[PDB]
Amino acid sequence: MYEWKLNDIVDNGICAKCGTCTVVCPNGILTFEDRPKLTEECLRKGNGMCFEVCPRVSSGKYQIKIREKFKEEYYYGKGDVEGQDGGVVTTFLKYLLKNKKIDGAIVVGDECWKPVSLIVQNEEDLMNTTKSKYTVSTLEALKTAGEMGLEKVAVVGLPCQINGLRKLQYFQYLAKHDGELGKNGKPVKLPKIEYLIGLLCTEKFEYDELKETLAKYNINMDDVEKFDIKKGKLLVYVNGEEHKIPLKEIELSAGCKMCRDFDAEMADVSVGCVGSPDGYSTVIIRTEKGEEIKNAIELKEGVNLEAIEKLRDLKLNRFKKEVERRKAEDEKVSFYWTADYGGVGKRADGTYFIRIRAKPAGWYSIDEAREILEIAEKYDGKIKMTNRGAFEIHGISGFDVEAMVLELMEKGFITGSEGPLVRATLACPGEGNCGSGLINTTELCKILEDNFKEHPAPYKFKIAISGCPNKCVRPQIHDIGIAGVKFPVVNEENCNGCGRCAEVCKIEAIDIRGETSYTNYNVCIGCGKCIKACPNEGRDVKEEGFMVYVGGKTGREVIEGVSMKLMSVEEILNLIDKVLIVYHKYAKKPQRERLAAVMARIGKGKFLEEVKELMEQN
Amino acid sequence: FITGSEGPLVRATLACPGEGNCGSGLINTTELCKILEDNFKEHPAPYKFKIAISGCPNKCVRPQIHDIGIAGVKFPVVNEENCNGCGRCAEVCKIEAIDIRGETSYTNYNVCIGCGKCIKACPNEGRDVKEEGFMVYVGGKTGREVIEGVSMKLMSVEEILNLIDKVLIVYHKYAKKPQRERLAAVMARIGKGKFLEEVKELMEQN
Amino acid sequence: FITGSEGPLVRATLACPGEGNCGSGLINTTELCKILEDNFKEHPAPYKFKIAISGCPNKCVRPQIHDIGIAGVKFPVVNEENCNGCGRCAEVCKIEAIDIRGETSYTNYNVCIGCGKCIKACPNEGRDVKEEGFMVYVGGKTGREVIEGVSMKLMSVEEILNLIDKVLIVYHKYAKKPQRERLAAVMARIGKGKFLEEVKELMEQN
Amino acid sequence: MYEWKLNDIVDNGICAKCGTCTVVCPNGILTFEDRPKLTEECLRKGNGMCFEVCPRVSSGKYQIKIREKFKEEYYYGKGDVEGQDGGVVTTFLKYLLKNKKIDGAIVVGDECWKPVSLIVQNEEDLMNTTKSKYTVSTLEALKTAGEMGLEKVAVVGLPCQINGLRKLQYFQYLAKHDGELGKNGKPVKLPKIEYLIGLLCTEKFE
Numbered sequence A: 001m002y003e004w005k006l007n008d009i010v011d012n013g014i015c016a017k018c019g020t021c022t023v024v025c026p027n028g029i030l031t032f033e034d035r036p037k038l039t040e041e042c043l044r045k046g047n048g049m050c051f052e053v054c055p056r057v058s059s060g061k062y063q064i065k066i067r068e069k070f071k072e073e074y075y076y077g078k079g080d081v082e083g084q085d086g087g088v089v090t091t092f093l094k095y096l097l098k099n100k101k102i103d104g105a106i107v108v109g110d111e112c113w114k115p116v117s118l119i120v121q122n123e124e125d126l127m128n129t130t131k132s133k134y135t136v137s138t139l140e141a142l143k144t145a146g147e148m149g150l151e152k153v154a155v156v157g158l159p160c161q162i163n164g165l166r167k168l169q170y171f172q173y174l175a176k177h178d179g180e181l182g183k184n185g186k187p188v189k190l191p192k193i194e195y196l197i198g199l200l201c202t203e204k205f206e207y208d209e210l211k212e213t214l215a216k217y218n219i220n221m222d223d224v225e226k227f228d229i230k231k232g233k234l235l236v237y238v239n240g241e242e243h244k245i246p247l248k249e250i251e252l253s254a255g256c257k258m259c260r261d262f263d264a265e266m267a268d269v270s271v272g273c274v275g276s277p278d279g280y281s282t283v284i285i286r287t288e289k290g291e292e293i294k295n296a297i298e299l300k301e302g303v304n305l306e307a308i309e310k311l312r313d314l315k316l317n318r319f320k321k322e323v324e325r326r327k328a329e330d331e332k333v334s335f336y337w338t339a340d341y342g343g344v345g346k347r348a349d350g351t352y353f354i355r356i357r358a359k360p361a362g363w364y365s366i367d368e369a370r371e372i373l374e375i376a377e378k379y380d381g382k383i384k385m386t387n388r389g390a391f392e393i394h395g396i397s398g399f400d401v402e403a404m405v406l407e408l409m410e411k412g413f414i415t416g417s418e419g420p421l422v423r424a425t426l427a428c429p430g431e432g433n434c435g436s437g438l439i440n441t442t443e444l445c446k447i448l449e450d451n452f453k454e455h456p457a458p459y460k461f462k463i464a465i466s467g468c469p470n471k472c473v474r475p476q477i478h479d480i481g482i483a484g485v486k487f488p489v490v491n492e493e494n495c496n497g498c499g500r501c502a503e504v505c506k507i508e509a510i511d512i513r514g515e516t517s518y519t520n521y522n523v524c525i526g527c528g529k530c531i532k533a534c535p536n537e538g539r540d541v542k543e544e545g546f547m548v549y550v551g552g553k554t555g556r557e558v559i560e561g562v563s564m565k566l567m568s569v570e571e572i573l574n575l576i577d578k579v580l581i582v583y584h585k586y587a588k589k590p591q592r593e594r595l596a597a598v599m600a601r602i603g604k605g606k607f608l609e610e611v612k613e614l615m616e617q618n
Numbered sequence B, C: 001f002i003t004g005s006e007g008p009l010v011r012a013t014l015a016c017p018g019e020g021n022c023g024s025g026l027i028n029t030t031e032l033c034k035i036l037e038d039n040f041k042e043h044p045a046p047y048k049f050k051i052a053i054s055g056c057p058n059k060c061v062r063p064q065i066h067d068i069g070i071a072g073v074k075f076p077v078v079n080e081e082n083c084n085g086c087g088r089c090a091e092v093c094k095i096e097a098i099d100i101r102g103e104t105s106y107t108n109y110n111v112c113i114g115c116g117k118c119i120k121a122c123p124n125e126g127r128d129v130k131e132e133g134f135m136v137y138v139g140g141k142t143g144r145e146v147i148e149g150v151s152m153k154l155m156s157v158e159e160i161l162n163l164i165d166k167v168l169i170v171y172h173k174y175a176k177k178p179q180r181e182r183l184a185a186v187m188a189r190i191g192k193g194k195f196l197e198e199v200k201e202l203m204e205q206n
Numbered sequence D: 001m002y003e004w005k006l007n008d009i010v011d012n013g014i015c016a017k018c019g020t021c022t023v024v025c026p027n028g029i030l031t032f033e034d035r036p037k038l039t040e041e042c043l044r045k046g047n048g049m050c051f052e053v054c055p056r057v058s059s060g061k062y063q064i065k066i067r068e069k070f071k072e073e074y075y076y077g078k079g080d081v082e083g084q085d086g087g088v089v090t091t092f093l094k095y096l097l098k099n100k101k102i103d104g105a106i107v108v109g110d111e112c113w114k115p116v117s118l119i120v121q122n123e124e125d126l127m128n129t130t131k132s133k134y135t136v137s138t139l140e141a142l143k144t145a146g147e148m149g150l151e152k153v154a155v156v157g158l159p160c161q162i163n164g165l166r167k168l169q170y171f172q173y174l175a176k177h178d179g180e181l182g183k184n185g186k187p188v189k190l191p192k193i194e195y196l197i198g199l200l201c202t203e204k205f206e
């Protein structure tokens, strides 16, 4: 009926039926019935925020996870309400409402097992939403919460819903622009999602399919008191009886076959039954927001982690079997999980490139280079050497990306230097390799990489380290630049005006006069060459070390960083850490505002003064 | 294998993956790089001489600060009959050159860098090509000093070959300090307009 | 009295006292300013258009960031038979372009800006005139942005009048936003080399 | 009454009743009856192109005249049709139509001495517009010509109308921006005003 880009996901059985896309539309022309659908013509043909938040187009997982910095602490517990298992989810939501942490909760109730998305603002309304509904649910109450103007909500969701809503939270980083403007010039109205409470999930069903399946076992769904999925069985409690149906005999919603995420790995806290005794819920705490559940539930340790891990593996194997089937039948596949990994980019022709983060100063062992070539050959890749000294492998099929990246990681290689984060530090050969080198660039590069590699930033962030003021790797137009320097001072007792030093100074900073020489320090760049060329011990070291620049860049615009001063390695590490903090503080446009643009916007002195203050608190 | 790219001569030409490889690529950077290498590799110059070719205005290989720089460009012009003000193109323009107004859109050509992104993103055939080709810069460098080359104009491959040949001749004519004076230094010394005028004259005799 | 120097037109030309008034002056700034005013005062342009004339490279009236800039210059060349390496000239060169060596001296022409002071300070007729005249810059501004104009070359007063006339014509031709696009913005938009090439072609038809 | 800034001119007896303001509105919410009138709410409260073309707010005459570079040659004559005086205006308009110099003429007819602004495209319709109508006239047919898509017109106007239409021609120089965009994101549709034929005038009556 209407042209809509996501029809590619929905019409080919890849859609998770999570409901994320239908809550973000600023024109309100999307609704979720049995699937996402347009209620009228979209002038963009679906080229917009719906498509951009869809977790089955692209997971966004790597860029989200490096920001959330997930932990993984395993507990089990029970609350004080009768729930599906322990009543933990509802008890936690009651605690968050009581303590004014949220204005409401987005939860799933039911009308005779037909799920309904609800915005609940009080304990009484929350009590109708306990228990699992094992059929397609939506997130539509998020739109209602936004119409009501609620500031903050918690959302309970299946893994696919958690993944969509993490893309919503991180939209500016993943889509690289602000939320889509509607016809009236304004973005969609939605509450802030303050807590993401995830459910473990192996599958959900279409309501009609479940009801028909039950009818085959002479069960009237309308009469069921409770459903459960335990140990490969659908449990059905009706008329005071427990009925078991093997899950193998029930058709799952088609999109669950394309699913990889069992335990809602991106949630603040994930809750399930696997791994914990009956009557308790398993609780996997991953973030500081999730850590607040400790205040709501008396938690215990002793989870059966292997029971959880086996379901992770079973779900992954199901996904792999379905992808292989689609490959064999030439059916549509959306390679949404390529974004689980750093260093993966999509080429113009729909295959991918994999960037191996450049090693310090571009040194590679022969064995290392041979290993890269062997992996490239195995996957039909083509070698491209980048201008930061990285191997980049081109032409990789979406079907091979994950396997190849994992093989590279097993051999010890890090894929990365892509996306809004600290890119591979670029250093020259430096002292003891290049005859002009004044500092150990390789080791400083290794130190900077060890401390900051792949650390997130509002936009790409690039560091360069040159061994001398020739600045071959261009530190004076990098976000942070370091250049080795060694300034001379003439020794009056020894210099005899022989004249040799002036000959090696290409910038002509030396004045040979009578029986002596001078240095013009308004021109001298501290290359140290005159000190090394003098045969008469006529030039001593005035000052030497690591010269530092902050706030430069190339690309669309050339900006020279602000010259700072000579700094020690400890000071440089402090500086980089605090620059990243102040950049985060003031950046307003992820994936658009480089550090130099933030400094320009707020004032170079103001930005540098705040960095110095944080450094001194360190 | 050819050992080289050292000393006072035309160094290895630096090109990105370009069109058909990078999703942003607008020109065949590899083939143009091969052409420039075939014509000028290891040709002597008063000092090191570096050429760069970027596939689009993101300029990853920094052509705007090379002795000679080329950047692929593709400028848009809105088709008033098709554009409906949907708003999608403005979302892909990171430098915010696009004005969405009512049922149409506009381009601010004092900001637009000709990346072509809006043309590719439009779902309604609302943006056509205004102008496209190889944008050329002359007289930049990095190293001890950062100098942005003089923006020239769009040029054909044949014109670029003529230009590079003539730049090298005029550089040799006016350079006085081999191994110290880059092209940018010679242009600064004698006047950028004087230098480029003489290059143009030699190109026309060609 | 003429009321003016306001709106989108050629504003009052700004000149320093120059030769015979300022001790550093090398050219007759008052007369050149009078000539430019007589030829172009209040002439329309797409946006304000400002000319400055400095008497020497100190550039007190800032010709290097004006729409058209002129600076008087006088470059030295050492008279090898007369220079005795006394050292006086180096003392008056604030930019330190002079190398005193043994019984002679040298000038670093990658630094010398042609102020002529060494010629005047030498007591031994050791420095003669290498080159002198009106150095010209095109396409600078201050205000909301700082832009340095493109260095051209030394020009005659006859050539400068031709240049200004043709710059104004090419500026009109390519300007799209009256009262918003300065000359520098038009040059940036279409390419500095492209703009200056068109100017030269019109100058040659004159 | 709908808020409209040009009410400061109309309500204080300064309005010339030329009609210029009511032809430029890109939303078509201005009409001219006995005076300029808003037919619905203006979101800008009249802060826009109507006010910016009004010759009684600011003449713009200096910036216009330095561009038009008016001469002043005096003649008298008669055409070949019966007019007010010599029939010169109608004859000239008949010549411009016949030689395809314009697609139509904006002229003032009458219904029993009530003036009516007309867009005429042939000699037959032009002949009903001879003679002076000494009461308030408008320029409203410019809007019709714009709706019809006519490329070029001639306009006959009283001095105040000529002054307003010169501001329209020079809008970007005087208002310092492009023509106002309507709610649909597009500017007003008007023909290019290729000829402005002014009438001498000491007064008009209600």
Ligand code: SRM
Binding pocket: A345, A346, A353, A355, A358, A385, A386, A387, A388, A389, A390, A392, A417, A418, A423, A424, A426, A462, A477, A478, A479, A552, A553, A554, A555, A556, A557, A594, B015, B016, B017, B021, B022, B023, B024, B025, B058, B059, B060, B061, B094
């Ligand atoms: C591979 C590489 C070019 C090369 O030929 O070597 C590259 C490749 C891309 N760059 Fe870059 N950039 C690469 C170095 C650069 C550099 C130079 C550097 O980093 O030393 C710059 C300018 C220096 C700087 O940024 O300070 C650079 C400035 C950009 C920009 C403009 C950024 C800006 O702030 O102006 C973009 C576009 C954007 O980010 O919007 C971009 C975007 C890209 C993308 C990801 C665009 C795309 O996919 O549509 C390109 C991937 C194509 C591919 O096949 O890999 N690339 N890019 C370089 C990889 C370096 C590495 O190993 O990590």
Ligand code: SRM
Binding pocket: A427, A428, A429, A433, A434, A435, A436, A470, A471, A472, A473, A506, B005, B006, B011, B012, B014, B050, B065, B066, B067, B140, B141, B142, B143, B144, B145, B182
């Ligand atoms: C290998 C390399 C650095 C790297 O880590 O990758 C390099 C290495 C040297 N550079 Fe460079 N330059 C290298 C790229 C650069 C660049 C970047 C570029 O070319 O894209 C620049 C600045 C960009 C530019 O020049 O426009 C650069 C600016 C210099 C300069 C200063 C030139 C100037 O005009 O300011 C010198 C010293 C000199 O020429 O006096 C220099 C001198 C040198 C010498 C030959 C100095 C020496 O031997 O004492 C270094 C050789 C050391 C070695 O181990 O190879 N190198 N050098 C780069 C080789 C590129 C290639 O494959 O051909």
Ligand code: SRM
Binding pocket: C005, C006, C011, C012, C014, C050, C065, C066, C067, C140, C141, C142, C143, C144, C145, C182
């Ligand atoms: C009087 C003066 C300032 C002063 O204290 O001396 C001046 C006064 C105004 N300038 Fe200016 N500008 C004056 C020299 C400058 C200069 C310096 C120069 O011309 O040497 C510049 C920057 C140099 C340049 O333009 O290259 C300058 C850049 C501007 C700008 C920004 C232009 C730009 O392209 O960025 C504006 C605003 C605009 O044009 O939009 C402006 C606008 C104005 C206006 C007309 C704005 C207004 O009326 O709202 C000011 C009139 C106020 C008044 O009381 O006169 N004025 N203005 C200067 C008169 C010079 C003369 O005698 O002709």
Ligand SMILES: Cc1cc2nc3c(=O)[nH]c(=O)nc-3n(C[C@H](O)[C@H](O)[C@H](O)COP(=O)(O)OP(=O)(O)OC[C@H]3O[C@@H](n4cnc5c(N)ncnc54)[C@H](O)[C@@H]3O)c2cc1C
Binding pocket: A082, A083, A084, A085, A086, A087, A088, A089, A090, A091, A106, A107, A108, A109, A115, A129, A130, A131, A132, A133, A134, A135, A136, A137, A156, A157, A158, A199, A200, A201, A202, A203, A204, A229, A271, A272, A273, A274, A281, A282
């Ligand atoms: C379709 C589905 C499949 C599941 N599969 C597994 C599994 O394989 N293994 C496992 O360990 N656990 C699974 N669970 C989770 C488990 O059944 C319990 O829901 C979980 O342990 C929480 O129990 P509780 O007593 O603490 O929560 P309660 O206090 O009972 O609260 C239950 C919460 O679940 C939410 N909810 C219920 N149905 C839906 C739905 N369809 N979509 C979104 N939210 C919903 C409600 O909004 C409510 O907040 C699944 C749940 C669902 C809905």
Ligand SMILES: Cc1cc2nc3c(=O)[nH]c(=O)nc-3n(C[C@H](O)[C@H](O)[C@H](O)COP(=O)(O)OP(=O)(O)OC[C@H]3O[C@@H](n4cnc5c(N)ncnc54)[C@H](O)[C@@H]3O)c2cc1C
Binding pocket: D082, D083, D084, D085, D086, D087, D088, D089, D090, D091, D106, D107, D108, D109, D115, D129, D130, D131, D132, D133, D134, D135, D136, D137, D156, D157, D158, D199, D200, D201, D202, D203, D204
């Ligand atoms: C209100 C008014 C006052 C005038 N006062 C003087 C005066 O003081 N001194 C003087 O020398 N001449 C004045 N004239 C001009 C003069 O009356 C003749 O119109 C002029 O000489 C042209 O005559 P014509 O035979 O060549 O033109 P014609 O061929 O007769 O054509 C006359 C043209 O006048 C236009 N026209 C008529 N009435 C109006 C109007 N109200 N508004 C705009 N356009 C109109 C018609 O469109 C037509 O094209 C005045 C005209 C008007 C309308």
Ligand code: SF4
Binding pocket: A024, A025, A026, A027, A028, A029, A030, A038, A042, A043, A044, A045, A046, A047, A048, A049, A050, A051, A180
């Ligand atoms: S208006 Fe935007 S969010 Fe809505 S369906 Fe269209 S592209 Fe999607």
Ligand code: SF4
Binding pocket: A006, A009, A010, A014, A015, A016, A017, A018, A019, A020, A021, A022, A036, A053, A054, A055, A056, A057, A164
């Ligand atoms: S996976 Fe979710 S966000 Fe994507 S099309 Fe389906 S319901 Fe929409």
Ligand code: SF4
Binding pocket: A016, A017, A158, A159, A160, A161, A201, A202, A203, A204, A255, A256, A259, A260, A261
């Ligand atoms: S298996 Fe669960 S988390 Fe996955 S698509 Fe299905 S309902 Fe969503």
Ligand code: SF4
Binding pocket: A428, A429, A430, A431, A434, A435, A436, A437, A438, A466, A467, A468, A469, A470, A471, A472, A473
């Ligand atoms: S920056 Fe200096 S030490 Fe490093 S490769 Fe270049 S010349 Fe050698």
Ligand code: SF4
Binding pocket: A490, A494, A495, A496, A497, A498, A499, A500, A501, A502, A512, A516, A517, A533, A534, A535, A536, A537, A538, A539
């Ligand atoms: S510093 Fe050394 S090389 Fe230089 S003039 Fe003195 S003695 Fe000679």
Ligand code: SF4
Binding pocket: A486, A487, A488, A504, A505, A506, A507, A508, A509, A510, A519, A523, A524, A525, A526, A527, A528, A529, A530, A531
């Ligand atoms: S340290 Fe280098 S730049 Fe400085 S005087 Fe010595 S040779 Fe010259």
Ligand code: SF4
Binding pocket: B016, B017, B018, B019, B022, B023, B024, B025, B026, B054, B055, B056, B057, B058, B059, B060, B061
């Ligand atoms: S310059 Fe453009 S085409 Fe080339 S790699 Fe960069 S983003 Fe791609």
Ligand code: SF4
Binding pocket: B078, B082, B083, B084, B085, B086, B087, B088, B089, B090, B100, B104, B105, B121, B122, B123, B124, B125, B126, B127
């Ligand atoms: S050019 Fe295309 S993407 Fe942009 S507003 Fe117009 S129809 Fe939409």
Ligand code: SF4
Binding pocket: B074, B075, B076, B092, B093, B094, B095, B096, B097, B098, B107, B108, B111, B112, B113, B114, B115, B116, B117, B118, B119
């Ligand atoms: S071509 Fe690029 S810079 Fe220009 S308007 Fe389009 S997206 Fe923006």
Ligand code: SF4
Binding pocket: C016, C017, C018, C019, C022, C023, C024, C025, C026, C054, C055, C056, C057, C058, C059, C060, C061
């Ligand atoms: S620019 Fe030179 S001649 Fe003019 S006042 Fe200044 S120092 Fe004197």
Ligand code: SF4
Binding pocket: C078, C082, C083, C084, C085, C086, C087, C088, C089, C090, C100, C104, C105, C121, C122, C123, C124, C125, C126, C127
């Ligand atoms: S040029 Fe003159 S002032 Fe300079 S060292 Fe020679 S004799 Fe002395």
